[PDB]
Amino acid sequence: MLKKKQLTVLDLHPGAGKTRRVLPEIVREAIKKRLRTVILAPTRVVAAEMEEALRGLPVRYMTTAVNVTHSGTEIVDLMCHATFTSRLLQPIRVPNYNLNIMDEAHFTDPSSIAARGYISTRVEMGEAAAIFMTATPPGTRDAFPDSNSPIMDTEVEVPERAWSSGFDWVTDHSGKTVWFVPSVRNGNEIAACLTKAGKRVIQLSRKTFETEFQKTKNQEWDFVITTDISEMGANFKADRVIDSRRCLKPVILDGERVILAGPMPVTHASAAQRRGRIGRNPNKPGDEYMYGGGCAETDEGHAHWLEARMLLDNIYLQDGLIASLYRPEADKVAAIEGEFKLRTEQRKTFVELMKRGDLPVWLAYQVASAGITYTDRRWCFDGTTNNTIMEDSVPAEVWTKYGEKRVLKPRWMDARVCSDHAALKSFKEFAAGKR
Ligand SMILES: CNC1(C(N)=O)CCCC1
């Protein structure tokens, strides 16, 4: 594995021990061989779990998720996928790591795809080694991989709205359920229905994950209602998964707007990871996987792969050379390598609109490539009427930085800025000049 020019896919089944057994063996070998190593965790929760598995090994934790006094002699760095890609885009020197280890390497957020493209390009150049750890590599067609213990797989109609009748099996259960929903708003309605039926419900999504995930350890619960973020190494002491088998697909329409299409079927990889939350205890056979639809390759034409190209076009590799997407995920949506490469000041604007602005990649790119500076928010108000953002069926309004009350009507409409109440609140603060 550890030889220059090798990319290894470590594709042991979910719960096989990639994170807690194999990763420390890899790191000890890497240290013996004096390999400057990076370990990429998908989330702060996984970063903290890795610290427990690696405790006693000299690892530099480049995350506030871990409170450790570093020796300053570590040659192994650990950070999140997003942090790696962020530091590559910033005017900060990222070491040319000899060994690049990506845990939960199926993650399809743009920064994870971009990190795989950068790393796989360095390996192809003959510069580095890489290990991608995941039960479900890109293009897997198996939604039912092996598990530590037998799983009961059942195809069943799964509610996606509040219900009064016809789904007794949902609430008759006396254990712990992880339920994958396609969106925060859909989980909100299911969670309210379960809470009314007397259940204890925890909701997880990207923006809430570190904080809310701790509740799954610190309090008794009957249901976790989660988006797809729990596919990325989230472990639960559960005995059932309920899987809508649905997700939202961001889609760029006519190069000019992003919609959240669907809900529509998950990929096989997503279905396998959702299912893979259970069957993990070799002493507890018969965990249940209830699934409410089929799989499809909904990663084709999905905006994240075009967003990953926007990121990689703006990462220095060598002269004007541009890192390719990792080959198995490289031909999922039309892109021309280099088409999104920005001149120095526009690139800085692009980076800040993502880092400080918290805007989606695609929307950051539209603003930066238009020659708009980071603090110029006039574009948030000068779009067509059909780009009016709505709040409870009325046009959303903010006070501009000038003190003027204006309707929020962005020049470029990206549905992710108002996917839920928290997103809309954040975008209103942005439009107002508050960050
Ligand atoms: C730059 N990548 C390609 C794409 N996704 O359009 C070019 C055709 C093959 C893959």
Side-chain angles (χ1 to χ4, degrees), residues 179-252:
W179 187 330
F180 285 89
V181 295
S183 69
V184 172
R185 282 180 166 166
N186 271 176
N188 290 338
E189 177 170 348
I190 291 157
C193 182
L194 294 166
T195 296
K196 179 164 180 188
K199 302 304 185 176
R200 299 163 293 192
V201 185
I202 295 164
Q203 297 175 250
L204 305 179
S205 69
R206 279 172 176 71
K207 290 304 298 199
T208 67
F209 191 81
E210 204 186 14
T211 306
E212 288 309 287
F213 180 77
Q214 183 65 23
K215 291 194 180 156
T216 71
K217 295 210 270 287
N218 188 51
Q219 63 197 62
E220 267 144 16
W221 52 270
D222 301 309
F223 287 76
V224 163
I225 297 332
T226 180
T227 69
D228 69 313
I229 189 55
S230 291
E231 291 168 17
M232 259 58 64
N235 291 309
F236 306 94
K237 177 193 329 303
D239 61 356
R240 177 169 74 162
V241 168
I242 292 180
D243 190 358
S244 63
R245 290 268 190 105
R246 302 243 284 183
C247 63
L248 290 181
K249 188 192 176 172
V251 178
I252 301 150

Side-chain angles (χ1 to χ4, degrees), residues 390-408:
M390 300 298 288
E391 186 172 356
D392 303 316
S393 316
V394 63
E397 288 175 7
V398 304
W399 288 270
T400 72
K401 67 190 213 179
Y402 295 97
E404 191 192 13
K405 202 82 181 291
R406 293 194 78 183
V407 165
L408 187 61

Side-chain angles (χ1 to χ4, degrees), residues 309 327 330-337:
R309 277 259 43 91
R327 180 43 262 199
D331 199 6
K332 295 192 164 170
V333 64
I336 290 100
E337 287 169 4

Side-chain angles (χ1 to χ4, degrees), residues 37-54:
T37 301
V38 66
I39 303 166
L40 303 178
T43 66
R44 289 166 58 95
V45 171
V46 168
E49 280 162 17
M50 282 180 166
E51 184 275 334
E52 201 173 278
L54 299 167

